[PDB]
Swiss-Prot record:
Na(+) binds at residue 84. The active site is at residue 28. ATP binds at residues 59, 83-84, 91-96. It is found in: Cytoplasm. Residues 1-194 are annotated as: ATPase domain. The gene is gyrB. K(+) binds at residues 75, 78, 81, 93, 97. It comes from Escherichia coli (strain K12). Belongs to the type II topoisomerase family. ADP binds at residue 32. This is DNA gyrase subunit B.
């Protein structure tokens, strides 16, 4: 359950004190975007550091399934869910659900099939069912997660360089995947595309 991971966070995400786990959180969201890219659907991934020390990742793939509790929610709220959807990003067997369970807030926005969907979680818990919130022609998935300050302790702020270097590496391992980093705190931006 998501409680298993709040109980023993380090074991799932890395060391929650020294900043390792807190940065690892980003790469267990990006992991799925790189996979969407690798399956041929996702062309670009925008990773963003927000003034409030949240990190959003936006892809332009198919958009996590919305059908039904919804598919999306299953993925977000069940540890094993990810296996129902040989390359890169994250640690084998860890999906976005670990990220959600360790985030005080996570906002999910899916653009799929002419419609925008939004949903918010607190500490893993959905605030409402996934819901339609307008029309769009774009497709993609967007996760914005605010790390729990109940889990991550000393290093609590995302460090642009740690992110930059690993995103560049990931885009190099996966030729053609366009990864962009943006930092809204200072305007700093990079594009990684081999
Ligand atoms: O999670 C992301 N994208 C994503 N992730 C998926 N996923 C799969 C397992 N955990 C996350 C995912 N699955 C997709 C899918 C799966 C089956 C049919 N159609 C679409 S699109 C997609 N898109 C982006 C924000 C980082
Ligand atoms: Mg993973």
């Amino acid at each position: 359950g998501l409680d298993a991971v709040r109980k023993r966070p380090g074991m799932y995400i890395g060391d929650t004190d020294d900043g390792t786990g807190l940065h690892h959180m980003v790469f267990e969201v990006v992991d799925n975007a790189i996979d969407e890219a690798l399956a041929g659907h996702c062309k670009e991934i925008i990773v963003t550091i927000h003034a409030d020390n949240s990190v959003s990742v936006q892809d332009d793939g198919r958009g996590i399934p919305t059908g039904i509790v919804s598919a999306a929610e299953v993925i977000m709220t069940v540890l094993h869910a990810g296996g129902k959807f040989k390359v890169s990003g994250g640690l084998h067997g860890v999906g976005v659900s670990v990220v959600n369970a360790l985030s005080q807030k996570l906002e999910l926005v899916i653009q799929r099939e002419g419609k925008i969907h939004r949903q918010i979680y607190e500490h893993g818990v959905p605030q409402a069912p996934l819901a339609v919130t307008g029309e769009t022609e774009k497709t993609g998935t967007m996760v914005r997660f605010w790390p729990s300050l109940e889990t991550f302790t000393n290093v609590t702020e995302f460090e642009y360089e740690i992110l930059a270097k690993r995103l560049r590496e990931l885009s190099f391992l996966n030729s053609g995947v366009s990864i962009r980093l943006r930092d809204k705190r200072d305007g700093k931006e990079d594009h990684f595309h081999y």
